[PDB]
Subunit: 268 residues, 4 copies
């Protein structure tokens, strides 16, 4: 059976088999969910890099900045899951901020064009995935986005934090649209997960000054977290997203679940 | 198979079979948990109630304000669960504020003795129960208290709100103690549930003024909750506690999960 | 005498004489501030309106979306205030959301173009103005923007709420930059004031259907506010901004001061 | 002239001359306020300290744990300020947790009688004084308590933190009551300041480990604070308290002003 047994869940954001979305997809399939995966205009690129999930899953093209991809999402999901089936779950794990908005570009030097793209994909596309999929979501259904607690400013994250503040705000509005469908909308605020993107940042692609800043932020999590924080382990975070996809948090929406080791709840 | 399968879980606070504790225990059992219940005083009267549970559970005595109680709990639990066995969960679902500090009475008119007693039971006993039980908890274990979001003042909850503020703060310190045991500590902040004392609040014993203030409270909650809020139904709360008791929020502690229909995320 | 004696303060966002900006600027002047005003699209109507102010203040053009206006702002402000003088205060009271992102229009129907513009104006420009003006601010300086508590979703406000969420996040990052200059950055989270966007999609008229939600929403401030809320009266919010522009809140930055009658502290 | 000119302000909790409390009174007097002061057992030692204040103030006796002191205070305050004179401000700067609930003693080991006493003095007495004093406050008045951000758990502060959480809640409720008199109630959430029992309770009289763990705690402020935090300067806090005592924050109540260098707004 498993936690998500029977549930039809669309999972966006997988880019690598170390993506938070990939582990979310993984844990979901292990828990019996039936997935529909999405990846940007690169349904063929997500093809190479996800033949690694426990079960096969239809993969669909979605560039969330593409209003056509969005108008047709519901259409192709249905095609994918079977006419007469609906989604039980939607995982939005799409986050992106041009590195001009997050990494060593001064916070002030991030062009709005880039911030705006960061917010399009990171925050707004949450409302657009909700708009696209809510009509093909079952009551008791669950939308989950990925958050990184922006409630305090932090070095390097910069405009991405801004985008996550925006996303949290968007989440409470999604929940209110979502609740007309009996659907809940929540975010999972993850502690830092050193994946493909994060390790190059800390590896100094976005330079010494930002890698340092991220490293020192990211190391504060484990010190802070009463239960610690392994940034190399997406599983706790994937399991939390699946808890949100399950029927075990039936009265939470508009909300944020911290899967951060309890870091956010401790000063030091 | 069940969410909580193979979990040993202490549930405190079942005083009647409608109190969220009862529902927690019930769902916990339906999820495959082996319960140790606590009660104090009317212990033969509490076993009459816990007899209405799906499964037998040892009922131990525990006045949470007391020590031949608290200091002996771990021992008595260990005897109840057996040599070699530890608890995976602790549920604190004890809330008491003398009615002088409740909705009927002016905020300024609650004596400290009563406030103090209400905080002892509702907040400080959370630390007490963690102190008592942590030694006999398994890593990955989970302590959950019951919260009623006190971040905004509400009339006709008065000092109880204050007690829940205190609880929330206690929860975060407990988490930091619990983490040393690999153990989570969280609060489930429930929407308003009618019991036999929060029921006896609205039922008549509060008189017009406090009964109307509480109904205005509870009705706005349903309005606010994007997925709605059912005053009468403890299940969503009970499931949430169980989520928390499960392995599915392994990265959450010091924290609060709002099982409140999302009301706290919406202004109207 | 006067809170703001000797202080030079840039006030942006005066479009009207009822606008929070107008009253901030008036209060600042009554308090002995020397103002610089900025404005954009109807600059001669603006000059008419800034006349209704106790003292004349130069109006400089400033389209916050215009990077060249921004790049030139300090030098114009400086020529306006005389060389060797720097600003002590900056008021950002610019907030705008294309009404696709507000009022009667779905949250889901706002094109991103519109959300992006509103966030540009409402949130990003706060960092823009900080960037433009920090170089010409005195230590002990203050930058204040206008917030509307977006911590909880509400009907109508929609994408403007999201932009206010972004703005609060923007503000904390701006504080971090501003602090280098010994400058504070804070937001005043105002209760609702009727002017030309919390009253021109309001207006007690865009249907007797969902105009009702917003009416419920907005009359909830006065009712929630322990000291009440007067929607017609920008003075208390203007005074709050002035306190932040003063030296009387010298240890507060990256922060939000709620000038809302304490409504957001109260659930009902 | 003066910020608080004409203001009759009662200030409680002056117990050292290095206090936030002592500096609130000093700054209040420098700003024209006529003070009334209160103290309890160490009455010679308090009358000594308050002599260090630039102006004479009546010192009245007030054990906030004493319902006779409280039910009486208003009469004595009137006696000292003169019949038909009301207070315009009340400052609650009474904070005390017995040692077992603070610093080095585990959080777990604090007996409730200590916790209860700390909460009585630190939180409940905020409602006590408001109740004692609201009847003799002017509309336009202002009650201010001293907070220390308890939103996240930190080492050492322990049950003091819990007390602070409770106070924050108490304040929101005080605002309800107070708002019936035209009176605001707010807390100033100060950064760590080094007092007398902070040249003891972190200076050199808790241990070696409680003058380096509270020190490590407290020095993260100045790191985090965008405009910095001087542990030794209670003036920014005293001034913030006076802002709140002034008419410059007329729309804020039930609230918390963070005079903490903006530290709570920033993660690293």
């Amino acid at each position: 059976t498993g936690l998500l047994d029977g549930k039809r869940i669309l999972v966006s954001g997988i880019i690598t088999d170390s993506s938070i979305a990939f582990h979310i997809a993984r844990v979901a399939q292990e828990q019996g969910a039936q997935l529909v995966l999405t990846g940007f205009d690169r349904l063929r690129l997500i093809q190479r890099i996800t033949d690694r999930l426990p079960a096969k899953a239809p993969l669909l093209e979605l560039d969330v900045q593409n209003e056509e991809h969005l108008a047709s999402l519901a259409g192709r999901v249905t095609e994918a899951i079977g006419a007469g089936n609906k989604l039980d779950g939607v995982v939005h794990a799409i986050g992106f901020m041009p590195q001009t908005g997050m990494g060593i570009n001064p916070f002030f030097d991030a062009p709005y064009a880039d911030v705006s793209k960061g917010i399009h994909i990171s925050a707004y596309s949450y409302a657009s995935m909700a708009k696209a999929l809510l009509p093909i979501m079952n009551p008791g259904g669950s939308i989950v986005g990925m958050d990184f607690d922006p409630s305090r400013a932090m070095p390097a994250y910069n405009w991405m934090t801004v985008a996550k503040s925006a996303l949290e705000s968007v989440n409470r509005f999604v929940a209110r649209e979502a609740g007309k469908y009996g659907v809940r909308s929540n975010l999972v605020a993850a502690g830092p997960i050193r994946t493909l993107a994060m390790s190059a940042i800390v590896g100094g692609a976005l330079g010494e000054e930002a890698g340092a800043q991220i490293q020192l932020l990211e190391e504060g999590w484990d010190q802070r977290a009463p239960i610690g924080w392994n940034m190399k382990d997406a599983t706790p975070v994937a399991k939390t997203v699946c808890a949100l996809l399950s029927d075990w948090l039936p009265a939470t929406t508009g909300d944020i679940i911290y899967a951060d080791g309890g870091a956010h709840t401790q000063l030091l």
